[PDB]
């Protein structure tokens, strides 16, 4: 299942060599992440967006979470 | 009934995640990434995505 | 010939009556029935579970690069 | 085992092959001939042995039954003389030529149930059985026998009648052509007895040259292609370019005064008559069957010739099973032995219920 | 060539059976795998 999902992600991003490299790479808290995101937003500033992000984070909890936030922060 | 409620919750969560991505900045790529993140690590996935983007360029 | 090869395969899997029954079963199975990316996916699962063995398998596949045979092997696995 | 043995009978234009389903080879093979004085009727080898005092009949001369009275005698002979079984006690799988008239299929069915009282029967196309024997359900079969040759495209087990081609050029014509060129060489093979000798020379020393002209040049400037053949009286004769000139007629019928396309061109034409979506499957699965496809070198020659006719991007593969001389019979033995085929037999009950025409629905 | 294929087969999972299977493949693949599994079940 996970391997199939990784192959689908590689296809969306784009071949076989790239998929093999991705497989090799794969083979190779929440509050802190939120604070880091706010600090990154401050560096970018801006302030209004940070307030909106705090409201959005609360909404997600109302409707694992740390891993998704970390990936988004890395993309920046 | 219960299945329909679960589908609505998933759609609402996806919309909220997309808004967060836009602020820190597609939807199909985000859905694939979210499923992979739920299974299991996060830093490694980000590195692979960055490498794939460089290859596309 | 192809028919002779099928009989030889049945004998290896397996007195004369028993061999005939095995051949009939193989023929029935064939009637009922009537690549590189897949190998990489198997390697990724092995790496998650080991890593050295997965690297050797990838190297062997590269050396080989038949395809049909590989596919069959994968299926068997 | 609860079931009695089922019979498999391959009706050939020149030779009939009979045996029991499940076996690897037919138990008997005999000439498709019936003879009466110039014991009242002679069938098979005996008719041939005593042809001197008989008038011979060939009821299935070109693959299609033309005289049912004598065909019935061949079947009687098959059961009681060759296989030594009672037809009313065993299901019978019979083979038929490609493009066999619908009325003939009903006749065969009626004769089995009403004359021989078979408990069950079925009829399958010869080419289809050969394809089955090769482990395939899709492909094109080039069947070359004694009195006729056919190119039969088959997809998912079904022969495609619109694309089937018949070539009235086979083993018999090649035997007579060899008699003719050996006679032109300086020998003399003209009598019926001599025809049998040449047929033997043909089956033992002939071959298909990869390149006709080059082979002719080699034979003209050296004795490297010559082979000796000893007659029963001790005389040893020499066969040279006749070895490959004989079967060359399959590729160039003009050598026989025929305007027909050679076997390679006929195979190509059949494929071209099929839906474009399955042509690549046919090109990649061209199977040879029949005694006349036994010539050494024929597979490589077909590969070369088809490749020249087909698109350069086409993958061409000629399959020549070592046992292709009896692949029709073997395919029947395999089919009749299949678990899923048992429900396909036409039972005496079904025959009594629907009559002869049921064969069209049951044996599509 | 044949030896390399045998090593790959061992990692995925005798030698005579592999050689016979390779010859059959040279002479679809999914159907052959199903037949081998059925034969193993019959032997059991
Ligand atoms: N090894 C061989 N080489 C060439 N021709 C052969 C060989 N063996 C048999 N034949 C020829 O094949 C023909 C019979 O083949 P077969 O498929 O049994 O025909 P049919 O079914 O029409 O009677 C005869 O003409 C015979 O001479």
Numbering used by the authors:
A (entry chain R): 8 to 21, 28 to 41, 50 to 84, 89 to 101
B (entry chain S): 12 to 36, 40 to 54, 56 to 72
C (entry chain P): 3 to 16, 30 to 49, 66 to 80, 82 to 97, 107 to 118
D (entry chain U): 2 to 39, 50 to 375
E (entry chain Q): 24 to 36, 40 to 53, 56 to 72
What does the paper say about this structure?
The γ-TuRC has a helical shape consisting of 14 spokes, each containing a copy of γ-tubulin presented by the C-terminal gamma ring protein 2 (GRIP2) domain of one of five paralogous γ-tubulin complex proteins (GCPs). The GCP proteins interact via their N-terminal GRIP1 domains in a specific order: the γ-TuRC core harbors four pairs of GCP2/GCP3 (spoke 1–8), followed by a sequence of vertebrate-specific paralogs GCP4/GCP5/GCP4/GCP6 (spoke 9-12) and finally another pair of GCP2/GCP3 (spoke 13-14). The inside of the γ-TuRC is lined by a lumenal bridge composed of one actin molecule, as well as two α-helical modules formed by the microprotein MZT1 (mitotic-spindle organizing protein 1) and the N-terminal extensions of GCP3 and GCP6 (N-GCP3 and N-GCP6), respectively.
Computational particle sorting revealed two distinct γ-TuRC conformations. In the first class, the overall conformation is similar to the isolated vertebrate γ-TuRC, and spokes 13 and 14 are positioned outwards from the helical axis (outwards conformation of spokes 13 and 14). In both classes, prominent GCP2-associated densities decorate the outside of the γ-TuRC. While well-resolved for wild-type RPE1 cells, the extra densities were no longer present at any of the GCP2 subunits for centrosomes purified from CDK5RAP2-/- cells, indicating that they indeed represent CDK5RAP2-derived CM1 modules. In the outwards conformation, density for CM1 modules could be detected exclusively on spoke 13. In the resulting cryo-EM reconstruction, NEDD1 density was stoichiometrically present, indicating that CDK5RAP2 and NEDD1 can indeed simultaneously bind γ-TuRCs at centrosomes. While binding of one CM1 module to GCP2(13) was associated with an asymmetric open conformation, concomitant binding of four CM1 modules to all GCP2 subunits in the first half of the ring (position 1,3,5,7) was linked to an allosteric conformational change that transitions the first half of the γ-TuRC into a closed and potentially more active conformation, providing a possible mechanism for how CDK5RAP2 CM1 modules may promote and regulate MT nucleation activity of the γ-TuRC.
